[PDB]
Design a protein around this nucleic acid. Sequence first.
RNA 1: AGCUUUG
Length: 93
Amino acid sequence: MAGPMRLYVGSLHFNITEDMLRGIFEPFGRIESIQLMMDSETGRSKGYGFITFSDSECAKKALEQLNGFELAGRPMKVGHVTERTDALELVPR
RNA sequence: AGCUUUG
């Protein structure tokens, strides 16, 4: 099978936690890691986070399965992860 | 800290 795969997770209430995501995506694929985003200034949640799977096809499953799932009643978004530094970084000529 | 939005 393919190697591990990592996805974005969001649209989560602050009431959501890294522990719930552990039970959310695990039955779809063996979880290799999670990183729920938290504020540097207050340590509070951010309502989104990262998660890694043992297989890309198991991540792709938990993707379309939890994509719009009403976790705590709000549809959580899921999708592939990607760089974004080019969205705002710059350098002199 | 509340919302799709990304290390």
